[PDB]
A paper describes a structure:
Viral determinants of virulence and transmissibility are still poorly understood, although lysine at position 627 of the polymerase subunit PB2 (PB2-627K) is now known to be important for avian influenza virus adaptation to mammals. Here, we report that a basic amino acid at position 591 of PB2 can compensate for the lack of PB2-627K and allows efficient replication of highly pathogenic H5N1 and pandemic H1N1 viruses in mammalian species. Our data indicated that a basic amino acid at PB2-591 can compensate for PB2-627K in mammalian adaptation; interestingly, these two residues are positioned near each other on the surface of PB2.
For comparison, we also present the crystal structure of the C-terminal portion of an H5N1 PB2 protein encoding PB2-627K (A/Vietnam/1203/04). The PB2 protein of the pandemic H1N1 virus shows an altered polar surface when compared to the avian H5N1 PB2-627K protein. The basic amino acid at position 591 fills a distinctive cleft found in the PB2 proteins of H5N1 viruses. In particular, the side chains of R591 and S590 in the structure of H1N1 PB2 occupy what would otherwise be the positively charged cleft in the H5N1 PB2. Our finding that PB2-591Q/627K (found in human viruses) and PB2-591R/627E (found in pandemic H1N1 viruses) adopt different conformations (i.e. a positively charged, ‘cleft’ vs. a positively-charged residue that fills the cleft and is located next to a negatively-charged patch) probably favors the former possibility, since it is less likely that they would both enhance interaction with the same host protein, but the positive charge introduced by either change could easily disrupt interaction with an inhibitory host protein.
Residue numbers in the entry: 540 to 676, 685 to 741
The structure:
Amino acid sequence: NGPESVLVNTYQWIIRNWETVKIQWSQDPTMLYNKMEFEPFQSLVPKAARGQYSGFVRTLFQQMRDVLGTFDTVQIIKLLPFAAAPPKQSRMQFSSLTVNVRGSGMRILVRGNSPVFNYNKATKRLTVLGKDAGALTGVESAVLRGFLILGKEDKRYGPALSINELSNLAKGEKANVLIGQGDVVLVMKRKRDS
């Protein structure tokens, strides 16, 4: 059972079982993250990264539960397998998350689409490494750790910052961030936390 099909089968599995997954993501997340069905995927994620990725993704998911009206189905399904590792707490922001496929790092972009995770809004279908993975059913809460994405660049808040330059922004302060793929968005550092 090679890596390509491990990635494809993992997302097909989340999709086929989304009814119970979604439920458990709200009502018993720990049990969901510990499901054995995520181990194959986990074996592909670089060992040095598994923990930090999981701490990042679980925090983002908690942001999304806490911040009401920001539930994003596609984002949850994308990031979920990275939550399966035991988390190591850290402060780093990630723009992509790696799965190793035969010595080559495939980069899953935290925001929007990539060869490994490509969602088509017209057909309502997910594609993983060119394989069809099945059908799927104003602030972004699961993109940055301890921030919300507000919307488009607002030039009033000054020149954009990269994702590793955000630590000095004051809590509650707003700023423009180079968020990946050349996109600049307005964000806000949260006062509330998890």
